[PDB]
Amino acid sequence: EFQDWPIVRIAAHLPDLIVYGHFSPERPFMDYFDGVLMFVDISGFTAMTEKFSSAMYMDRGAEQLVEILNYHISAIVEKVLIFGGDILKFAGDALLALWRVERKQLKNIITVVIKCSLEIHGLFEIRVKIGLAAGHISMLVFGDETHSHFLVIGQAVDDVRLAQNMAQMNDVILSPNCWQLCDRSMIEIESVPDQRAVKVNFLKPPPNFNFDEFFTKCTTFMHYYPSGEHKNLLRLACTLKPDPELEMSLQKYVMESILKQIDNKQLQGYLSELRPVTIVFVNLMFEDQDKAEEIGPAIQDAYMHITSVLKIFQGQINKVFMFDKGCSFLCVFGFKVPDELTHALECAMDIFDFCSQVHKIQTVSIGVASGIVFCGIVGHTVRHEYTVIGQKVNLAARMMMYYPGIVTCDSVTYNGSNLPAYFFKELPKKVMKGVADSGPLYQYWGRTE
């Protein structure tokens, strides 16, 4: 069976949530369901990135980095897929996986995901941290007529965010509501100081219990688990056949440079690079009260302006995330123009000005950093995404969190701009979660007072 159709190559970049959805054209589009979430933290990715930028790697740092990274990450992807999970998004530091099922089946599926989680630790006993959560989940699709983006929002997402914070290497942390819905007859835990979540230590099954027949029964509730003649496939998406209408909407989720490579109009090795870029990390904060029904329209309206300003200054959206009531856009400049830095700052300020006027948006924060970052396709053959990794990526992320409400930039961006100093204001250097002295940070003030 021939399976190398463009539509299949596009499907590799997307979860089943998008590939087999049937959304309206409306934007925003919301849907709601229940499932289990898995967040896998990889620690080392960013640290090793600066290692591979050394001259020891003789200008093959990027090629070597993506190779060793994909060696580990595709092993994590395989475990997730064979246990029936759907990988939603990759980022330099992590991936998020989803098991969407009927509410009545969450108890059984949590045991599946916990088992999955421990086999993933088994791969590296180079370490990871895993948080799990279960409950209600909302899906947000937004974009314009040629571009689409998605997010999962809700308690379960925030739950998996908190279980994220506590885990150390080799941990598997269950959110409180995941502990309350799980099969406690089977999961031995230990509590977390000043927390309602729990750490998992062992999965002790009843004597009669046989996981493989149990797992096979759970697949009954997994609409898209490969079976029958397709039991040896990792993804049913490998079996997609040409369908112009479906490919039309799927390609909107994928960056045009990726589509070029999918279309064999570009060297397949052209996208793994250690490249100078400017990262513009835009954070849109909402209040605790705000529910998904009100969030989606604000992000849509923010996104509509963001994309038009980015196209003007020649930037792209690399990744969209959301947690802790903040929706963040990882935007990249380069991958290049002579005065990239000035254009990055002016793009930030414009974004800051318009978005701060969208209502339901309580706060806009934007971090800007510039340097060498790894850019590449990360994941497994059947499930992968273009992704940027590097210390400058983490800096822009921590700046927009530690300096809310303003536009911040780093020392590299500050000196390299063609704008004069008084457009900036040097800031008090705060200590941040994994910052080996930033260097001097600045507020982009603007042209006048």
Ligand SMILES: Cc1c(Cc2ccccc2)c(-c2cc(Cl)nc(N)n2)nn1C
């Ligand atoms: C780091 C990362 C995130 C942000 C995130 C971090 C911790 C808990 C929950 C979300 C997402 C993500 C994906 C989707 Cl589809 N929706 C939302 N809301 N977030 N994916 N990845 C790889």
